[PDB]
Amino acid sequence: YGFSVPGLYECNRYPCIKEVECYVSRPTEKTVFLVFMFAVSGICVVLNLAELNHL
Amino acid sequence: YGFSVPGLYECNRYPCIKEVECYVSRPTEKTVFLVFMFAVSGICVVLNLAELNHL
Numbered sequence: 001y002g003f004s005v006p007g008l009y010e011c012n013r014y015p016c017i018k019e020v021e022c023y024v025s026r027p028t029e030k031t032v033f034l035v036f037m038f039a040v041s042g043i044c045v046v047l048n049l050a051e052l053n054h055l
Numbered sequence: 056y057g058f059s060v061p062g063l064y065e066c067n068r069y070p071c072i073k074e075v076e077c078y079v080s081r082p083t084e085k086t087v088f089l090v091f092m093f094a095v096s097g098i099c100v101v102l103n104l105a106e107l108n109h110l
Binding site: 017018019020021 | 072073074075076
């Protein structure tokens with residue numbers, strides 16, 4: 001997924017003719033959710049590594 | 056105009072986004088009309104040249 005959800009998409013899949021432009025819903029909220037989940041998962045990873053090192 | 060009227064056109068003029076496809080009305084009749092007018096004009100040109108040469 002990367003780190004952001006763009007508001008525009010360029011699509012060239014059949015049956016679309018040549019290349020078309022499509023528009024996404026709530027890109028900003030989805031970006032915020034993505035970043036927050038990444039941060040929480042990183043914290044979990046750090047704590048798990050600390051535990052493993054302690055063992 | 057050339058010698059034919061194609062049935063499809065590819066257009067990339069503002070405000071159209073990128074390139075779009077457009078469809079023409081009665082391409083075959085217009086092609087026939089174009090060729091017929093060209094032939095008649097050519098006959099007229101030949102006759103006029105013959106007259107001028109005679110003078």
